Amino acid sequence: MGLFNFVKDAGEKLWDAVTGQHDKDDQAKKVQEHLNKTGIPDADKVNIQIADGKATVTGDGLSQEAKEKILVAVGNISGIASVDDQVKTATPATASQFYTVKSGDTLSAISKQVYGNANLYNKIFEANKPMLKSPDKIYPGQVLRIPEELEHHHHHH
Ligand SMILES: [K+]
């Protein structure tokens, strides 16, 4: 209900994660820019803070999908180990799970893990977008956003 845990070393290499580059809001700056570069929706609706590697998102008035959306992009920074969600939602949306890619897994393999079916790799990857590069282009530490598999009966191919 507050903090989310991520990988640290894994994610977009925005800065020199070896030390933290320069300063707190500068680290955040990269993150904000990163979300704008990637094209993360509602990334302007929120706000990002950085505490060495503990990022904090805030904002209000978006959907929960938008909120977590930012979390993923912010929590997938090389240098960021976690994201403190402080952003508020104005409209009802479906909540998702967060799965961290392990060394050897593919979008399919993890989809099969989270959904029970690998064919749902797209639902994840496209949801991890535009943060995620490509399905088989994941990387160890990629905490992919796992949308809620509504009605397990049918749907899944
Ligand atoms: K990270």
PDB file of N, CA and C in Angstrom, residues 98-135:
ATOM      1  N   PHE A  98       3.470  -7.277 -10.298  1.00  0.00           N
ATOM      2  CA  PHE A  98       4.814  -6.928 -10.735  1.00  0.00           C
ATOM      3  C   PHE A  98       5.728  -8.149 -10.657  1.00  0.00           C
ATOM      4  N   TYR A  99       6.261  -8.561 -11.801  1.00  0.00           N
ATOM      5  CA  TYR A  99       7.145  -9.720 -11.874  1.00  0.00           C
ATOM      6  C   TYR A  99       8.539  -9.305 -12.336  1.00  0.00           C
ATOM      7  N   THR A 100       9.564  -9.665 -11.580  1.00  0.00           N
ATOM      8  CA  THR A 100      10.922  -9.356 -11.967  1.00  0.00           C
ATOM      9  C   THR A 100      11.538 -10.490 -12.774  1.00  0.00           C
ATOM     10  N   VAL A 101      11.920 -10.159 -14.001  1.00  0.00           N
ATOM     11  CA  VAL A 101      12.557 -11.101 -14.909  1.00  0.00           C
ATOM     12  C   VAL A 101      13.836 -11.671 -14.316  1.00  0.00           C
ATOM     13  N   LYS A 102      13.947 -12.985 -14.363  1.00  0.00           N
ATOM     14  CA  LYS A 102      15.124 -13.674 -13.866  1.00  0.00           C
ATOM     15  C   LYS A 102      16.004 -14.114 -15.029  1.00  0.00           C
ATOM     16  N   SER A 103      17.277 -14.342 -14.738  1.00  0.00           N
ATOM     17  CA  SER A 103      18.261 -14.691 -15.754  1.00  0.00           C
ATOM     18  C   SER A 103      17.943 -16.040 -16.395  1.00  0.00           C
ATOM     19  N   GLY A 104      17.367 -15.997 -17.589  1.00  0.00           N
ATOM     20  CA  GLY A 104      17.049 -17.216 -18.303  1.00  0.00           C
ATOM     21  C   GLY A 104      15.612 -17.248 -18.775  1.00  0.00           C
ATOM     22  N   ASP A 105      14.797 -16.350 -18.240  1.00  0.00           N
ATOM     23  CA  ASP A 105      13.390 -16.301 -18.581  1.00  0.00           C
ATOM     24  C   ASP A 105      13.146 -15.436 -19.806  1.00  0.00           C
ATOM     25  N   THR A 106      12.100 -15.772 -20.540  1.00  0.00           N
ATOM     26  CA  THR A 106      11.649 -14.971 -21.662  1.00  0.00           C
ATOM     27  C   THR A 106      10.225 -14.506 -21.396  1.00  0.00           C
ATOM     28  N   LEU A 107       9.737 -13.526 -22.151  1.00  0.00           N
ATOM     29  CA  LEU A 107       8.387 -12.995 -21.937  1.00  0.00           C
ATOM     30  C   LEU A 107       7.376 -14.145 -21.886  1.00  0.00           C
ATOM     31  N   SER A 108       7.515 -15.077 -22.819  1.00  0.00           N
ATOM     32  CA  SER A 108       6.667 -16.259 -22.870  1.00  0.00           C
ATOM     33  C   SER A 108       6.759 -17.063 -21.573  1.00  0.00           C
ATOM     34  N   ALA A 109       7.983 -17.371 -21.166  1.00  0.00           N
ATOM     35  CA  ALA A 109       8.227 -18.163 -19.967  1.00  0.00           C
ATOM     36  C   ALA A 109       7.620 -17.514 -18.729  1.00  0.00           C
ATOM     37  N   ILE A 110       7.723 -16.196 -18.639  1.00  0.00           N
ATOM     38  CA  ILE A 110       7.220 -15.476 -17.485  1.00  0.00           C
ATOM     39  C   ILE A 110       5.709 -15.307 -17.589  1.00  0.00           C
ATOM     40  N   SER A 111       5.191 -15.138 -18.803  1.00  0.00           N
ATOM     41  CA  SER A 111       3.758 -15.118 -19.014  1.00  0.00           C
ATOM     42  C   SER A 111       3.137 -16.428 -18.561  1.00  0.00           C
ATOM     43  N   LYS A 112       3.799 -17.525 -18.881  1.00  0.00           N
ATOM     44  CA  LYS A 112       3.340 -18.836 -18.486  1.00  0.00           C
ATOM     45  C   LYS A 112       3.366 -18.987 -16.970  1.00  0.00           C
ATOM     46  N   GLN A 113       4.172 -18.159 -16.353  1.00  0.00           N
ATOM     47  CA  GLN A 113       4.410 -18.179 -14.940  1.00  0.00           C
ATOM     48  C   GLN A 113       3.339 -17.380 -14.206  1.00  0.00           C
ATOM     49  N   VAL A 114       3.025 -16.234 -14.776  1.00  0.00           N
ATOM     50  CA  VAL A 114       2.152 -15.256 -14.154  1.00  0.00           C
ATOM     51  C   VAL A 114       0.697 -15.451 -14.567  1.00  0.00           C
ATOM     52  N   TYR A 115       0.507 -15.934 -15.781  1.00  0.00           N
ATOM     53  CA  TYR A 115      -0.818 -16.123 -16.337  1.00  0.00           C
ATOM     54  C   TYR A 115      -1.184 -17.591 -16.376  1.00  0.00           C
ATOM     55  N   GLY A 116      -0.161 -18.429 -16.378  1.00  0.00           N
ATOM     56  CA  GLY A 116      -0.369 -19.851 -16.533  1.00  0.00           C
ATOM     57  C   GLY A 116      -0.323 -20.254 -17.991  1.00  0.00           C
ATOM     58  N   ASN A 117      -0.137 -19.263 -18.853  1.00  0.00           N
ATOM     59  CA  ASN A 117      -0.073 -19.489 -20.292  1.00  0.00           C
ATOM     60  C   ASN A 117       0.925 -18.530 -20.926  1.00  0.00           C
ATOM     61  N   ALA A 118       1.857 -19.072 -21.702  1.00  0.00           N
ATOM     62  CA  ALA A 118       2.938 -18.279 -22.284  1.00  0.00           C
ATOM     63  C   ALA A 118       2.449 -17.410 -23.422  1.00  0.00           C
ATOM     64  N   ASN A 119       1.301 -17.767 -23.967  1.00  0.00           N
ATOM     65  CA  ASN A 119       0.758 -17.066 -25.131  1.00  0.00           C
ATOM     66  C   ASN A 119       0.321 -15.651 -24.754  1.00  0.00           C
ATOM     67  N   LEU A 120       0.297 -15.384 -23.457  1.00  0.00           N
ATOM     68  CA  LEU A 120      -0.161 -14.114 -22.935  1.00  0.00           C
ATOM     69  C   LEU A 120       1.017 -13.182 -22.740  1.00  0.00           C
ATOM     70  N   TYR A 121       2.135 -13.571 -23.333  1.00  0.00           N
ATOM     71  CA  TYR A 121       3.368 -12.809 -23.231  1.00  0.00           C
ATOM     72  C   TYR A 121       3.159 -11.409 -23.782  1.00  0.00           C
ATOM     73  N   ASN A 122       2.252 -11.297 -24.737  1.00  0.00           N
ATOM     74  CA  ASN A 122       1.961 -10.024 -25.349  1.00  0.00           C
ATOM     75  C   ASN A 122       1.254  -9.118 -24.361  1.00  0.00           C
ATOM     76  N   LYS A 123       0.284  -9.656 -23.621  1.00  0.00           N
ATOM     77  CA  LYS A 123      -0.499  -8.831 -22.716  1.00  0.00           C
ATOM     78  C   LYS A 123       0.419  -8.155 -21.717  1.00  0.00           C
ATOM     79  N   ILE A 124       1.455  -8.874 -21.318  1.00  0.00           N
ATOM     80  CA  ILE A 124       2.462  -8.325 -20.444  1.00  0.00           C
ATOM     81  C   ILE A 124       3.312  -7.321 -21.188  1.00  0.00           C
ATOM     82  N   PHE A 125       4.032  -7.785 -22.208  1.00  0.00           N
ATOM     83  CA  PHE A 125       5.009  -6.949 -22.895  1.00  0.00           C
ATOM     84  C   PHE A 125       4.406  -5.612 -23.318  1.00  0.00           C
ATOM     85  N   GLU A 126       3.226  -5.663 -23.929  1.00  0.00           N
ATOM     86  CA  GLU A 126       2.564  -4.456 -24.424  1.00  0.00           C
ATOM     87  C   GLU A 126       2.118  -3.565 -23.266  1.00  0.00           C
ATOM     88  N   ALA A 127       2.009  -4.161 -22.095  1.00  0.00           N
ATOM     89  CA  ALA A 127       1.602  -3.447 -20.895  1.00  0.00           C
ATOM     90  C   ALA A 127       2.816  -2.827 -20.242  1.00  0.00           C
ATOM     91  N   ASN A 128       3.941  -3.490 -20.445  1.00  0.00           N
ATOM     92  CA  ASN A 128       5.215  -3.021 -19.943  1.00  0.00           C
ATOM     93  C   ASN A 128       5.695  -1.878 -20.827  1.00  0.00           C
ATOM     94  N   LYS A 129       5.120  -1.801 -22.023  1.00  0.00           N
ATOM     95  CA  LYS A 129       5.375  -0.706 -22.951  1.00  0.00           C
ATOM     96  C   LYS A 129       4.903   0.616 -22.367  1.00  0.00           C
ATOM     97  N   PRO A 130       5.417   1.724 -22.895  1.00  0.00           N
ATOM     98  CA  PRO A 130       6.502   1.709 -23.868  1.00  0.00           C
ATOM     99  C   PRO A 130       7.869   1.622 -23.190  1.00  0.00           C
ATOM    100  N   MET A 131       7.861   1.160 -21.949  1.00  0.00           N
ATOM    101  CA  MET A 131       9.083   0.958 -21.187  1.00  0.00           C
ATOM    102  C   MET A 131       9.860  -0.237 -21.732  1.00  0.00           C
ATOM    103  N   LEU A 132       9.158  -1.327 -22.034  1.00  0.00           N
ATOM    104  CA  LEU A 132       9.820  -2.536 -22.492  1.00  0.00           C
ATOM    105  C   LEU A 132      10.184  -2.423 -23.965  1.00  0.00           C
ATOM    106  N   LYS A 133      11.391  -2.862 -24.281  1.00  0.00           N
ATOM    107  CA  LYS A 133      11.903  -2.845 -25.642  1.00  0.00           C
ATOM    108  C   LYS A 133      11.151  -3.846 -26.520  1.00  0.00           C
ATOM    109  N   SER A 134      11.353  -5.134 -26.261  1.00  0.00           N
ATOM    110  CA  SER A 134      10.642  -6.192 -26.971  1.00  0.00           C
ATOM    111  C   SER A 134      10.557  -7.435 -26.090  1.00  0.00           C
ATOM    112  N   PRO A 135       9.602  -8.323 -26.380  1.00  0.00           N
ATOM    113  CA  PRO A 135       9.278  -9.476 -25.530  1.00  0.00           C
ATOM    114  C   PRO A 135      10.503 -10.310 -25.155  1.00  0.00           C
TER     115      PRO A 135
END
